[PDB]
């Protein structure tokens, strides 16, 4: 089974930053619908990972769930951090995003940012109390995931 | 005042309204200036307000990375002052001069440093930004760093 045409259109619009279509399709029932076809992202996951600030804003003001997890355990903040979207990350935290949350393999937003080499995001998450000693399933901290030649995030971490 | 077309183009650039930019932007209009503000061009507006699609279209349609507003600022100043990394990346890729100075001799690195933007500073540095250049006051970008953005200070050290 697939999503209704309307939830499909809502998810697409969020991925594309089409705030006018989001307004049209966003209700209390639909706001946290899931892309069952893909990896079960909510509109907010899509908006966050694609850096659609105006959609993130609208979604959050309409009861979007900062705690909702996709098929792999990720919350929208993971998406924002993995892709280095600083403002989005800041908006999520401002609206209640838990910074220390872990996905199914115990990766935290900070693991993501570190591995991705996203310096400002690391500082942001730390500046907001993210725990650098957290280990994922492999026993790796965020520091452990920092690439060689990325000397500057190491010292930060 | 500006012609209506020019006014609409400048507003659309500020707004990130790329479809309206595409309809108004010609070789004659692309570097028009806002005579009722600080003589920003459409690229100054798009860069300052982090309109990536607009920045990209404009760069591909004759927009001048060397154009200066009433204060001698080029669009890279705008991007750096407001911490828009991708915008700054796009400007530098299209040949923005990293060491350009405004009327007070502030360089983009002076702006990034004062506004506490690390990755921007790192980008400018990697591109030959001169951390020793002094503005008219005798201040280097290092001089302008807020104590304590010690990472920035260390970067510029």
């Amino acid at each position: 089974m697939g999503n209704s045409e309307a939830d499909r259109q809502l998810l697409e619009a969020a991925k594309a930053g089409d705030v006018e279509t989001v307004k049209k399709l966003c209700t209390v029932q639909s706001v946290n619908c899931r892309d069952i076809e893909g990896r079960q992202s909510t509109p907010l996951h899509f908006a966050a990972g694609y850096n659609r600030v105006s959609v993130v804003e609208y979604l959050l003001q309409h009861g979007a769930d900062v705690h909702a997890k996709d098929k792999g355990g990720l919350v929208p903040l993971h998406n924002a951090c993995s892709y280095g979207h600083y403002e989005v990350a800041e908006l999520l935290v401002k609206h209640g995003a838990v910074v220390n949350v872990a996905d199914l393999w115990k990766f935290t937003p900070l693991h993501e940012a570190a591995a991705k080499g996203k310096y400002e995001i690391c500082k942001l998450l730390l500046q907001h109390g993210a725990d650098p000693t957290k280990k994922n399933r492999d026993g790796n901290t965020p520091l452990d995931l920092v690439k060689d030649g990325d000397t500057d995030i190491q010292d930060l971490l | 005042g500006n012609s209506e077309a020019d006014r609409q183009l400048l507003e659309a650039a500020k707004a990130g309204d790329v479809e309206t930019v595409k309809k108004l932007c010609t070789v004659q209009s692309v570097n028009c200036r806002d005579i009722e503000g600080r003589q920003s061009t459409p690229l100054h507006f798009a860069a300052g307000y982090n309109r990536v699609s607009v920045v990209e279209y404009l760069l591909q349609h004759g927009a001048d990375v060397h154009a200066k507003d009433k204060g001698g600022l080029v669009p890279l100043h705008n991007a750096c002052s407001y911490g828009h990394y991708e915008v700054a990346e796009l400007l530098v890729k299209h040949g923005a001069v990293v060491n350009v100075a405004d009327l007070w001799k502030f360089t983009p690195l002076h702006e990034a440093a004062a506004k506490g933007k690390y990755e921007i500073c790192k980008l400018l540095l990697q591109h030959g930004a001169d951390p020793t250049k002094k503005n008219r006051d005798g201040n280097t970008p290092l001089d302008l760093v807020k104590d304590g953005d010690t990472d920035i200070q260390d970067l510029l050290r």
Partner: peptide
């Protein structure tokens, strides 16, 4: 473990 939905750059 696959990527999240999204991308780094708007360009």
């Amino acid at each position: 473990r696959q990527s999240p939905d999204g991308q780094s750059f708007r360009s």
